Design a protein around this ligand. Structure first.
Ligand code: MEV
Length: 317
């Protein structure tokens, strides 16, 4: 038997933006969404996981113990107890997370990294099945599990994540992230309030339509079309949220966006805003350093990002 296994996954950015969860426990997406996994050029933005045999079950986030009192992570660990018993000689395992270049705690990358560790121990499991269990940890786990550009189809009862383009399809593109210091609306507030909107039923249908449009663009590697659409999706999504009192795009964020509209006439860009106080700007690689070097970031900090692949495991120890 072994004693432990490590794994790694990368954080994600929504491309067709998710709002609404079917149930607080299983956390199935109410409608179809799409996303990309990202890191920096070195691959240093990441979540690293260690699952190991133990006398009692402990959950740690960057060294801080969690009472995991919802049994969010512990639910997943219990479901795959047979995997751990075979691999480690015991059903009792602990989980230790270290996040780098993202905030300490649970995330899409954290969830996917759990999946990669389990698959690492039992490689003939169906990752689409494992994904269903991972959503309890984070509803967009599939983006990070499979990597690249994905679509997660969903009718609110059954959800399925499909790989649409490899990270290699974006090698000519970069994303400059502008991080603003405004306190963010929790994702749970986003999910809870968006469904109150009278436009919500049409949004769910519009979401599914946009994902089909993305699958079509993929046929000819139309990366600009995909990101152009992501910006249109972003604008619809945040117009719906504002009408339910959730305002993600704050004053200095809107000022940056206005400038983006100006330089768009000079060279191509498209932007995305998800749930946090960040503005993500897609750009052609030849213009990435130029964008990154602009002077008036309106008090935002800058990171150079790129599209990367799915979660992966290390050999068990
Ligand atoms: C707010 C948001 O990040 C929620 C994902 O659960 C939107 C998205 O990325 O699809």
């Amino acid at each position: 038997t072994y004693r432990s296994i490590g794994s790694t996954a990368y954080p994600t950015i929504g491309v067709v933006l998710l709002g609404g969860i079917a149930n607080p426990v299983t956390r199935t997406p109410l409608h179809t969404s799409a996303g990309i996994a990202y890191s920096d050029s070195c691959g240093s933005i990441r979540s690293e996981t260690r699952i190991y045999a133990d006398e009692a079950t402990h959950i740690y986030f960057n060294g801080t113990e969690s009472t995991d009192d919802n049994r969010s992570v512990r639910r997943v660990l219990d479901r795959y107890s047979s995997v751990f018993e075979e691999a480690f000689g015991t059903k009792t395992v602990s989980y230790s997370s270290q996040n780098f270049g993202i905030l300490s705690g649970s995330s899409d990358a954290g969830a996917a990294s759990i999946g990669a560790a389990i698959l690492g121990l039992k490689p003939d499991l169906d990752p689409h099945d494992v994904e269903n269990d991972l959503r309890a940890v984070s509803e967009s786990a599939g983006r990070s599990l499979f990597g690249g550009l994905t679509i997660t189809w969903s009718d609110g009862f059954h959800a399925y994540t499909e790989k649409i383009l490899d990270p290699e399809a974006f090698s000519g593109y970069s994303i400059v992230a502008f991080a603003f210091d405004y306190q963010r609306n929790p994702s749970d507030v986003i999910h809870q309030n968006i469904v109150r909107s009278d436009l919500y039923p049409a949004r769910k249908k519009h979401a599914d339509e946009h994902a089909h449009m993305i699958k079509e663009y993929a046929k000819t590697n139309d990366i600009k079309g995909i990101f152009d659409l992501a910006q249109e999706d972003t604008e619809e999504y945040h117009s719906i949220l504002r009408g339910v009192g959730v305002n993600v795009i704050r004053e200095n964020m809107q000022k940056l966006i206005s400038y983006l509209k100006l330089i768009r006439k000079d060279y191509w860009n498209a932007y995305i805003v998800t749930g946090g106080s960040n503005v993500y700007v897609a750009v052609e690689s030849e213009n990435a350093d130029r964008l990154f070097s602009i002077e008036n970031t309106f008090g935002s900090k800058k990171k150079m990002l790129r599209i990367v692949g799915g979660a992966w495991h290390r050999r068990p120890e």
